Amino acid sequence: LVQAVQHVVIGPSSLIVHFNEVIGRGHFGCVYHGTLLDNDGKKIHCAVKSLQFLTEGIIMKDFSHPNVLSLLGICLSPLVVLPYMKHGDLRNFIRNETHNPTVKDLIGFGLQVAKGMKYLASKKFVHRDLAARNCMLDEKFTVKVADFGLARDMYDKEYYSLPVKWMALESLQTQKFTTKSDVWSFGVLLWELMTRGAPPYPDVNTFDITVYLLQGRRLLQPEYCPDPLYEVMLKCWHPKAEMRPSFSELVSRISAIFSTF
Numbered sequence: 001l002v003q004a005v006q007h008v009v010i011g012p013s014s015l016i017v018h019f020n021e022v023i024g025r026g027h028f029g030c031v032y033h034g035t036l037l038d039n040d041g042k043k044i045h046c047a048v049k050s051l052q053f054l055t056e057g058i059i060m061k062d063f064s065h066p067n068v069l070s071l072l073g074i075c076l077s078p079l080v081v082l083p084y085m086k087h088g089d090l091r092n093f094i095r096n097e098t099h100n101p102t103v104k105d106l107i108g109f110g111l112q113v114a115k116g117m118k119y120l121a122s123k124k125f126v127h128r129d130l131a132a133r134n135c136m137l138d139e140k141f142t143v144k145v146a147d148f149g150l151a152r153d154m155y156d157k158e159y160y161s162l163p164v165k166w167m168a169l170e171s172l173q174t175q176k177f178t179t180k181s182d183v184w185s186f187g188v189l190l191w192e193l194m195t196r197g198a199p200p201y202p203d204v205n206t207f208d209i210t211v212y213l214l215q216g217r218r219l220l221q222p223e224y225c226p227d228p229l230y231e232v233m234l235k236c237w238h239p240k241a242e243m244r245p246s247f248s249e250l251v252s253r254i255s256a257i258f259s260t261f
């Protein structure tokens with residue numbers, strides 16, 4: 001096993017961790033700036049986090065897609081090495097008053113998420129916590145689906161003293177997660193993108209959501225959301241999991257809507 005993990009392991013001579021400085025001033029907890037040296041001697045700016053882990057490492061290392069956050073490696077508390085994301089999380093970015101993304105830009109972000117999700121689904125990977133705050137943006141504003149495998153619990157803060165509104169009806173009732181339940185969460189994420197990061201169901205309790213959805217009540221169309229995109233969101237919130245579109249069908253449908261702008 002210590003053999004099979006070698007290609008995931010980063011040698012202490014290849015990584016300089018800057019333990020004296022955190023990224024995003026506490027927003028992501030104790031995540032440090034880091035410098036990783038590759039085989040050609042190129043310096044890679046990275047984010048280093050302190051945390052059977054060696055196995056989630058092997059699997060995550062082989063997951064490569066431009067819309068999925070990659071795992072740069074692990075250093076043996078053991079350390080998780082990830083690419084540096086210049087513009088932090090997607091929820092934070094769309095909420096920031098300073099930024100003015102267009103309806104096209106917002107749809108483009110949703111398409112990149114669908115592409116990242118289409119790739120994870122093909123590798124039979126179930127996310128379980130898909131939401132705007134769990135997606136990152138790099139220097140070129142490329143969306144990376146994050147908060148899975150070794151990069152999970154990004155927002156778990158240490159003290160001294162379930163994302164139910166993104167969950168599918170069957171997941172709320174049986175605690176079982178599938179690709180079809182990630183399709184439901186993707187619908188909620190599209191709704192967040194179109195509302196520029198507004199909270200879903202603000203007047204409904206986390207305990208009242210099951211009864212609210214069983215009554216056939218759903219998130220309402222955002223003001224600036226095109227009609228075909230809203231039709232796609234409602235398909236994602238269908239009560240029968242088998243009736244929901246697949247992630248590949250989502251990419252096809254969303255890319256054709258994106259191309260009309």
Ligand SMILES: c1ccc(Cc2c[nH]c3ncccc23)cc1
Nearest residue numbers: 028047049082083084085151154
């Ligand atoms: C654990 C903790 C934090 C993350 C988020 C993350 C990965 N790279 C980054 N670069 C800049 C800012 C934030 C991040 C993922 C797992």
Ligand SMILES: [Cl-]
Nearest residue numbers: 086087088093
């Ligand atoms: Cl920013």
